[PDB]
């Protein structure tokens, strides 16, 4: 294949960097869930059931 220098020339919309209510609430929910997951008292079997989902 031959790359074309023109593929790297693109200008973003001005509103690109303005995050929505769903994007901001999603991140804050994940922050609360991440702290909760670190606090959870669970056995190795429950830990593996989640980790194994990516294999």
């Amino acid at each position: 294949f031959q790359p074309s220098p023109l593929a790297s020339q693109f200008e973003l919309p001005g509103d690109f960097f303005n995050l929505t209510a769903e994007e901001i609430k999603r991140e804050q929910r994940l922050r609360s869930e991440a702290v909760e997951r670190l606090s959870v008292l669970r056995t190795k079997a429950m830990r593996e059931k989640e980790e194994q989902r990516g294999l």
């Binding site: 929505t20 209510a21 769903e22 901001i24 609430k25 609360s32």
Partner: protein, 269 residues
Amino acid sequence: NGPEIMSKLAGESESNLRKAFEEAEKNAPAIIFIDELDAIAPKREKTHGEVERRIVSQLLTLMDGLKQRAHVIVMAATNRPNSIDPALRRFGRFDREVDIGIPDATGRLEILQIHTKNMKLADDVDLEQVANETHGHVGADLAALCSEAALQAIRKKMDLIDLEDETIDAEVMNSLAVTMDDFRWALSQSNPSALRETVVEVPQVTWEDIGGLEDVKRELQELVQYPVEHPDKFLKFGMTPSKGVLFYGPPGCGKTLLAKAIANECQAN
């Protein structure tokens, strides 16, 4: 408020306290409210400072001056009725007090209803369920729940319609309703500010909630209601009503329901 007066230099704290009383007389009828009373007038035997002992003396004399300052009532708030210098509670001065405590389940629902007067609620919103779940919450926390649930509904819908400005069309505002998911979200974010303190309330337990013990339920009514429902018979026969009863036996048999059930029927705390 205590801490603001105490933040002043010696002489400034006393002058500022006196001014408030002089202004109240000029503007009578007037009410002077002193917040954090234990901070402005802590127990003298519990401190070392001369200024703190002096400001207590200044408040004590200003309270006594209320016999001359017509139509002026002084109110104060503290966290604990026994955390203030006892002199303030002597005859005259602060001769009345009222225990506000913590709202009960009914009051918590009332607070949620008050802080939703203007809010459009969806059919799935159930504030009674919230009031029962919000154990340990006070009005400051329930107000936060209402405002936070409103914001979540506003950000989901209105923030995708309106500009970042101070003026919104009335129709857009009226089209925004708050769902139960927004109240549940706020509930998970809020944390009760008064969870450890004991809450006193009229219980909702009734006699129909207790299985068995039919004779005990009646006996409590005789012990608690009869002395005031039929006082002429107790006087006629020279009977001295009992002041209380002790229960004993295995745990988990309904002892808590027995005391609550009679309190419920009697509408007592």
